[PDB]
Amino acid sequence: ALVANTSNMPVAAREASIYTGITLSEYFRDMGYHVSMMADSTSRWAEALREISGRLAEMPADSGYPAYLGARLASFYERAGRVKCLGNPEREGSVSIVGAVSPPGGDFSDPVTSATLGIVQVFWGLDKKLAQRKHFPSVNWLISYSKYMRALDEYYDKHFTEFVPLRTKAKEILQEEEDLAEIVQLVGKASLAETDKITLEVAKLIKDDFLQQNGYTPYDRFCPFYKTVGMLSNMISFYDMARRAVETTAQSDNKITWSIIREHMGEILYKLSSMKFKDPVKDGEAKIKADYAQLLEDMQNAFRSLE
Amino acid sequence: TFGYVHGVSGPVVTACDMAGAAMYELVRVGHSELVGEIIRLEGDMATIQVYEETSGVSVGDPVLRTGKPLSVELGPGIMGAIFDGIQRPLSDISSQTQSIYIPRGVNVSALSRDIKWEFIPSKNLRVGSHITGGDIYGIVNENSLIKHKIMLPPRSRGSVTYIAPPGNYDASDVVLELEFEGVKEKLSMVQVWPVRQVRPVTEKLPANHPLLTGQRVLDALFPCVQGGTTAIPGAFGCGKTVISQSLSKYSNSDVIIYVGCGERGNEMSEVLRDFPELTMEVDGKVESIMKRTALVANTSNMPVAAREASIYTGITLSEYFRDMGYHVSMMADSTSRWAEALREISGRLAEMPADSGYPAYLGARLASFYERAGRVKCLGNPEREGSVSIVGAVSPPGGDFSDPVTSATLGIVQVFWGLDKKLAQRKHFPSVNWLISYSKYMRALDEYYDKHFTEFVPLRTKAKEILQEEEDLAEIVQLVGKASLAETDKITLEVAKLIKDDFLQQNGYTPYDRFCPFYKTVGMLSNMISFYDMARRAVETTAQSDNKITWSIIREHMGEILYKLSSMKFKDPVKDGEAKIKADYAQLLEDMQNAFRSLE
Amino acid sequence: QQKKIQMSNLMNQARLKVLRARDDLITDLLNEAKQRLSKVVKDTTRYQVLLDGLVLQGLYQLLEPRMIVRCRKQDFPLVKAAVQKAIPMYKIATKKDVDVQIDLEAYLPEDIAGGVEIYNGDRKIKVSNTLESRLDLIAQQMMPEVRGALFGANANRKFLD
Amino acid sequence: SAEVEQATRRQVQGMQSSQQRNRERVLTQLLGMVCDVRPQVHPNYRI
Amino acid sequence: YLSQPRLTYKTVSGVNGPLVILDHVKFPRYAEIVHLTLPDGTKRSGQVLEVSGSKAVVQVFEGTSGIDAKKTSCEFTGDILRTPVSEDMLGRVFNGSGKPIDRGPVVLAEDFLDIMGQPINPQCRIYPEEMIQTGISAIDGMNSIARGQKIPIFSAAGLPHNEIAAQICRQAGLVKKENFAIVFAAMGVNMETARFFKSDFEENGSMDNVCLFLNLANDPTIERIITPRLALTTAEFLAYQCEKHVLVILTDMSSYAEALREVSAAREEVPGRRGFPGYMYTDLATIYERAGRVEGRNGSITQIPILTMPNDDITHPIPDLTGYITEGQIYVDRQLHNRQIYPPINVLPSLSRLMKSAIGEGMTRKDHADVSNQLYACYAIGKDVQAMKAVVGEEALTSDDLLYLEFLQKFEKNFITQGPYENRTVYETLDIGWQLLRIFPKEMLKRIPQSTLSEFYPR
Amino acid sequence: KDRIEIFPSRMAQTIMKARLKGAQTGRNLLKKKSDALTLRFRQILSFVTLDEAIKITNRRVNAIEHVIIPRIERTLAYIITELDEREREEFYRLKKIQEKKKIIKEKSE
Known part of the structure; x- marks a missing residue:
């Protein structure tokens, strides 16, 4: 079950898309199913936050992003894991989250990359030089970790x-x-x-x-x-x-x-x-x-x- | 003399009913009497920068207005004491409270008022005689080394109406009274001088007498002169202890002042522990260095106002003895940490930053700091002379010389005792680079x-x-x-x-x-x-x-x-x-x- | 190897078990205190003295031009006297003329041991001046002394500064 | 595991014995302190 | 005690992001703690950040969603945030707010301390002396931690900085040539790691001497700011009032710094260098410097702050501002990790400025200083020879170069590589050092005096 | 010429710092090659081929030290300065925004 939201959609829906997706994910998690949630981009979500933060005339932090960007990402990323579900049946489900940080570059000073790295347990970084050499899948194997x-x-x-x-x-x-x-x-x-x-x-x-x-x-x-x-x-x-x-x-x-x-x-x-x-x-x-x-x-x- | 707190936005407290206040005046905010200064004023309201934590300050709290701006208390008992950057005796706070903490809102007088000092008048003055600023009207016998000469405060003069007879007086009594145009001023042994103001001298003289430190290197090749200014790099492995000890122990100066600006707790402990254990032969007797030394101690977690003010508190104490005719040698343990404190305040005040994030006036503050050193002809009829030397250290992040603080310092000091770490690794001391150092x-x-x-x-x-x-x-x-x-x-x-x-x-x-x-x-x-x-x-x-x-x-x-x-x-x-x-x-x-x- | 881990879990849970038992002792004492305060409010003259004090403290903390006192219905005769006295005392102490009314339409739940609540004119500011609330406030602020009195001082604590 | 449960019971019994020694005195102080109201006007009131 | 009835307000001027603006508040204090009750019966905590006349502005600890301006009530406590402290809380696990999360009771306080505390009077500060052994050879025989210093661990993201910190908690203790406790605070920790610390500490029997604070990544960001203040507040109580030595480990100070930047934005402060507050320097010093020895008491506090380097750049304000006011560094590398060496600590860039006082006769062993200096030179040389080997080959090396190459290979395999469950005391670490040094003949051990060699070198 | 001419950015800082480390490592490794060739050369003194190898290696090492690294360091210092300049103009705008907000609030009272 997909959730479709394009770049030409309103910024408020662009922000809410992630919350809608994870809400559906948790719903099925509570059924005892193993749920795998794929994000297209969390930089687009962070972009929505930057746009709205500006419109609200609230004080920004680094590179124009809201200072609470990390708090929003932690809220999303920490809504996952193998759990013991509520309800008499004692069922146990899980949600996996695969995030996606679109790289303005290989510099992880990027506020979104940096906040994500401090939260996520597994980071599969994609090497630019391997991509240029058409070596696929392009994985650095030196900067990644699990x-x-x-x-x-x-x-x-x-x-x-x-x-x-x-x-x-x-x-x-x-x-x-x-x-x-x-x-x-x-x-x-x-x-x-x-x-x-x-x-x-x-x-x-x-x-x-x-x-x-x-x-x-x-x-x-x-x-x-x-x-x-x-x-x-x-x-x-x-x-x-x-x-x-x-x-x-x-x-x-x-x-x-x-x-x-x-x-x-x-x-x-x-x-x-x-x-x-x-x-x-x-x-x-x-x-x-x-x-x-x-x-x-x-x-x-x-x-x-x-x- | 009281106003009221209107509101708190963090470390900044807004006062109301405070019309009678001057900028950079002092206030004691709240029931704990928190130390702060007035920066912006508007109408009968004032914006107070509080040095210490403001937690617990309420709207409606009293604020006591203190007429004097940030000032140093100068008088007997200054020697042998360790002070905070804003002139708070740490050796009395820890001993009058039995605590290990500096109390929030602590209010201990810089010079104790329970000491009965041995005071001898000059024996030349009489009631009806004329006295001017800088004149000495009596000497307090503190210890075997330094006589504490009692000067008429600058910007004061008149006819003498009372002279205390020889005897034992404390710092709260009246020793001399003088009348100017019918106005009588009662003076004790303690004078107050704004720390940011330069104490006047008769004239500023050239520095010609060498500073006779005990090292062959840093003397024969790279001379320093009494009243001169130098810089010393401060790195862990540079061996800066050698200069500190050699300068305080065997120098031909009379009074040593050691100024901390904002160092690591354990580093301040090393200085506070080592100094009391240093001695030197004087008249054939071995005396403690602390009998002719004063020290200002500030760690990195002290209020930023104190860390920034420490450098000026030290030099104010230095000039105080300069005006006595003594040769004073002041060491600033790290002027880079001071500049860090200064940048922090500029940030706190939301000032526009300049080079590498430092305030636009960084250079002006350093230039006016070192300009206060030098050999001078003192005020007062005694026609005495003295000097202040500065041997302040620099420790820029990374050890580079591009930092505006070290670059500005080197353009101001006339001697650079460049130290190195490679020499220390080779066990060659003192660790002087030679090719970089100059005088x-x-x-x-x-x-x-x-x-x-x-x-x-x-x-x-x-x-x-x-x-x-x-x-x-x-x-x-x-x-x-x-x-x-x-x-x-x-x-x-x-x-x-x-x-x-x-x-x-x-x-x-x-x-x-x-x-x-x-x-x-x-x-x-x-x-x-x-x-x-x-x-x-x-x-x-x-x-x-x-x-x-x-x-x-x-x-x-x-x-x-x-x-x-x-x-x-x-x-x-x-x-x-x-x-x-x-x-x-x-x-x-x-x-x-x-x-x-x-x-x- | 696993035996050591099992012992760790047993010792750690045993520590929590005794700590929980000690916390029940504190809770039981507080519950007994509440019953003893219930015995106090069953009095008349002693309880009226409590009300005289409680009303005054409420009025002095709220400092509003108009105040409403809310109490248990059965306590109205005693509160009425408490307000009649509190008013001239308040005016002398504060030099402010405050119109203090008692709420005769709404009353505190009958299960409260006693005490009053004070509201300002628009019912937007209230003073939690009930008897049960005051007891919890004092019991918690004084709790370090309760611990020592019941279970002994900390033998390893040498400096109280 | 028995020695751990045995010590736990003994520690609870000790706590119960200790708190009993002055249980009424500790409650008495709490009841007295709460009953004494001591009304006061906020220290920053200025009229 | 205050014994003053609390006032509860329903007067709200508005709500703006994390802030709730109240009205008609009587003599409000700055930093006062208040409690909110929402129409759904939900209770939430907050703290007053600004008081401009009767307009008190409170930051809500939890999210502000659901709060209105008509029914939500705000109860004022009349006081600031003061943490209940006791000896008994050692062996407990708390969240950032100071609440138990280990199914135990609320702390039965011995006292209440302002978590901001007070600066330690420098006149009574005692220079660090004895050593606290960690059990990890790479940081006991090379860069030991003096009983009173503050030495940070810099790590890149993805490296096992949390596994090392957990190992220190299990293994650390006194030299032993009952009065040692560890206070461990994790800021911004994710759920998986929070489980790691809690379960690893409980299972291995260490919990009796550990006070654990867990502030999770999805917990209120303001609570992350007090978390290290509660950890140090406890450390000060335990260390200075109960005469014992406390090791304080502050994990992920970079996450603290990020939460601090958020608080600055909440105050509408203009960001400073790289987006961080202009007061980050004094804020870090405020936490870091609440440690060390004090005159007249037998307790002490040490710190091992652990910091993730953004983009692995030591120049970044977070490790730069930290290191600028700390005494040396441990420094965890990446190459050692990719080579599957644990612990991955690189001894060449590390430094402990207080090691000179930590070690020596009467504290560890006579030869401690000599073994450290010789091993450092031998490792640095071995790396230099290894670089040469890559250029000239094995056949172009002389016998001395081969000894340095053999040392390098066995040094990392035997001395640095340890494993997470092997506890190496300081004396075994030195003996292992000698096993590496006895590779060389006496004449090549230039940094060890002959007297030391004659006693320790043989056998 | 004077700089590699990479537009100021945090990305440029990372690349230049990695490029500088690479150049410094190459300098040291080539210096070791030169030292090894020099020792063998002096021991012999297939001789002229060593003289050519030493001159070629030393010339490359000298270029790294006198041409390539100075140029990388100038580029890195340029990048750092320009990035601090961008931070300032952002500071200016944000400060004025905060002041304008306060001014609007005063007007409302």
Whole structure:
């Protein structure tokens, strides 16, 4: 059930639209349903507040916004969460809120961005440079955060047990790549450790064949979680095995390097880069998991024969 | 003398039935007698800026009008006390209440009225004699160090009608009565002077007498003069304690005033705790520094009016003793925190901001602050003289020099004792930057130096040239390693090091180096420069061909001389007298001249 | 591990349990006080003295050109006397002629122990001068002394400033 | 858990015993203070 | 006591946003607390912000919706906001207004204090001495907190500044070479984090020594302003009247500053620098400086204000005005967080100016100062060598450089990385330090005197 | 020329500050490259190729220090000044608005 309000509608309705939406959201929340509320823009709401604040001739704060902008945003954003509902049936529902801060720029001094960041638990910032490079979805991966890690750790450890440690390593690799990228742009890879070369190449594998997807294709319209973790599990498993091989044979005769690994088991990287295409629903869950198991078995044997 | 509160809009209180009030007059608002000032006036209504919290003030509360504007109470008992920025004794408030808090609306007289002071008249005045402003009619014996001279308040004169006989009087009694045109004025030992008004002097004189601080650096290279104004950077790692202690302990000034403007509580505690524990030898006895010191304490959470007024309260106390014929040295712990308080008030008053948010008049306030310092000829028939020096510190946010407060300060002060933190990390103290620091009194003191010491001036000129060359050679050394380098440059580099090590560096925690008398400072530099010239000549006169002198040869040849030069700082003035120290330094001069002679 | 967490919850809830019990003791004392004030208003001469005082304090706090006193119907004879006396005393103290009427059409709920309410002429300003309201006001403002009297002083409190 | 509930009951019993010792005296002071009206005109009244 | 019957007014001149303008009010006070009763029986609180003659202007704590100018009544208390304080409130959880939200009773007061309080007379302020160990090595062996200083934690949005603050509450205490309490106030906290603090404190048994104030993001913004005043009001009672040491943690002062700006707008004041009030400086000092030691008493108050840096710019007035009047900084970074290091505290930009007094013989251990100085130099050098490695490679490094690289890797993994549930006392932190220092031969430990090395270095 | 010529904004402040940090980091990393080349160069004294690498690296480092950073710092200082100027004119207008409101209120009495 949508609520439609365009930019050419009266400012008072532009302000009230958010309140109407959340009112409907809470109504269904009290039915025991899980409600997901999407906002188009909270900057347009803040804009309505700035326009009315001016018309009312009340004293403004930063950039013309009312000083109470933060109070209005907190009122909206705090009307959400998993609850125990009123009523005899003891039912429990939830409202999720996905806000939307239209960026006048990447400077989070923006009164709306700043007030939102102090309230919301999860912030999915969209990088301008990735958008310019047509890397989609465009997510910075360095300035974003989610404060629900510890809350979900029970879930992840209960059902999967593998996700939490894969998640940790994935974050380490992406951050390591950014720091290595800063120097490589300067020194041209003149001097890199074998592990550092692996991080750069696996991190590209991740950025291109895991964190990038075409959401208009049957294969990536929606990637089910078991598949998301499957893809990450194999790519990190490769990382650890490639890192062990070059560090284990380091300072010896038969030194293994990434160039040697790519030549020895190049078809492994081809398979890893192809994992996004297994196409769930058209193909079965049991087979996709079995196919990913096969990639892991092939990689493990590939390093055994290399070493 | 009462009006009524009409309304409160926050820290601003509107009064009614207050027609008889002057701008920047004082009021005590409400039943707690809150301290504030009148700024805007209209009809019989007045707008009062209250320094303290206004919570609880009601419409209809009384307001007591005080005729005097913000003023400092000046009289016996001022010495040894710690005051708030608006002249409130903190050592009495904490001791008369048994509290740890400064009471809201606290009303403690600046100078206690329960002390029976020993007062001796001048013994020259008689009933019927003529007295004018600034004249001294008696002295109060406070302590062994500072005699508290009782002056006729400025802007007062007439014929003396009563003189109190010698005896013990408190600050509430009448000591002298004088009549002008039939009007009799009864004067006690305490006078009141508006803090924003400059106390008049007969004439403002040039500053010619050096400020004899105990440090070799910040004296030999960067002189300060009594009555002069300097600035000192205030950073955590700069080692500002050395100047504060050295200035208050061993200075040739008579009275020390330490002014806080609005520092961190723990920093004010360090100053309040350290100062009472400092002592100095005077007449052979060890006396507490607090017997010739006064201190104004303001922390960052004090009323903004007090933090802004503190700087003027301090200098008013300074001038008070200036008019006695004393040499007064005032240190403002942080004039940047004062400027912060000043900007806050401008904001509170919704004034149009200027450069970096500071008031348009920032420069005018700083300029008129420092202009009040200087050597003066005092008022009154005693024809006495005195001076006020200012050694105020600056601590701009970020440590930058672009802040209008530091930029304006540097354009006003004539000496800058630029300190550094890098030197502190290298354990080199005092932490003086040398290349940034400067003194503009070098010419003003040329007459003194010529009259009493003669060789000091060419020595300090050569000393700065040697140190600057060491910096200029830095690029050559880095690119060479002292290989393709002139032997004359090696002399400059190694001698400049000697200067930095055994002259400009001073260790104040050693009993022999606590204070370096000037004659010792010039002795140490004279021998180092004399060596420099001899070493330059030894190389230059032999550098043609066949048989030349090099720095390595000099070091090997007269290594005992280089040791003796380094040892000179250990001549303890407490045990080795002026004649003995000069005698030993003369021997080094002979040892050196003969050592070089053996090379030709 | 879980045993330690369980003990934390038990000790924290036990602390609240005893604190709640102590708060009931205070509440029960206040309820007993109300019953004792009910016993007082059952008197005649002692209650009339309370009314004389209560009416005066109300009038002095409101300071309006016209005032209306509202009371319980059964207390009207006593309030009537209280106002007749309060008026000449008010005029002397304040030097202002105030027309003080008693409301004979509206009365306070009969369940109130006693006391009066004072309204200005337009019934827009009222003084909460009932007996029950005054008791709550005093009991709360004096409560720190009630705590000590009943349960003892704080042994760890060394400075009262 | 029994030791915690046992201590709680003992603490409540102690509070009950303590408040009883002067229960009537504390109530007496409160009743006396409320009964004494002490009327007063606001301190800022000026006529 | 006052013993004066309260006046209730139905005279309202108008209502304008958060303000209600009353009329015909008798001798109103500034900052007086009043209570509103709306036609629906709803009760609301407010405080008088301006009194211009008989026209008192009250700010309503809750929203002003539903308030009319004909039936709504306003009861005046005749007094200002004074908080009931006691020792018993330690172990309780309160909201911003001072009301219990832990299902316990209302506080049975030992006294009532004006929450604005009074400045501490500098003449009786005692310079900070002993240390209060936090249990977190990154801030015990590197930048310890003296028993009386005020050292802020600057964090960017999204970093685990609340998890560290919670860890400090669970682990902090005295060195122990019964008189220690923590007062923790969260301003503008969202519902999920408010649960985090409340549940984490209760479950781990720490609550007995914690007084917790939670002001939620959707709570009245004026209540957010008194919240830190109530926290310090309690701290002053507990510390100075009950002879004990109180650690006060003020979380999200940036949210306080935002609420303060809103109050300024309510007064129709012209905004100052970057939109903030011109008096933000003294307002922060008013809160911050109500701490430290006092002569003649054995209690103390310390503070660890925690501040989110808008746009991660330390220049912003909030961290700038705070740091300008505090003694050093802890400084939480982002790179350490993205590298999955907890705690993510960067020791190179941090500073505790009072550490010199906090540590040393008779307070912690003889070698404390020496271990800190050597570790700092070794970490700074290791970072410098790591930067070199990225340019010249591993084979271009010498043995000393490799030792600094090994130190860097093991320093962060063993010394800085801790976990939220491992409590490292000051003596174990120093011993861990030595484990890192014994990587180097004695001759490379230039900042540790030989006497210290001979006693502690071996074994 | 004298500035990068980015219109004054808070966005410009963030970009310039990040750009300055990048330039300073590059200066230090290239300085370390130069120092490593200089040590090897002096130890040898495939020789002339080191002399060219040192001159090219030092020239780039010198440009960062004498051309690029001074220019970034001038741009940043320009941005900060202009932004404070915009704050002032907003202050002026808001102050007059508050005074006009008070004037209107007086007229109504």
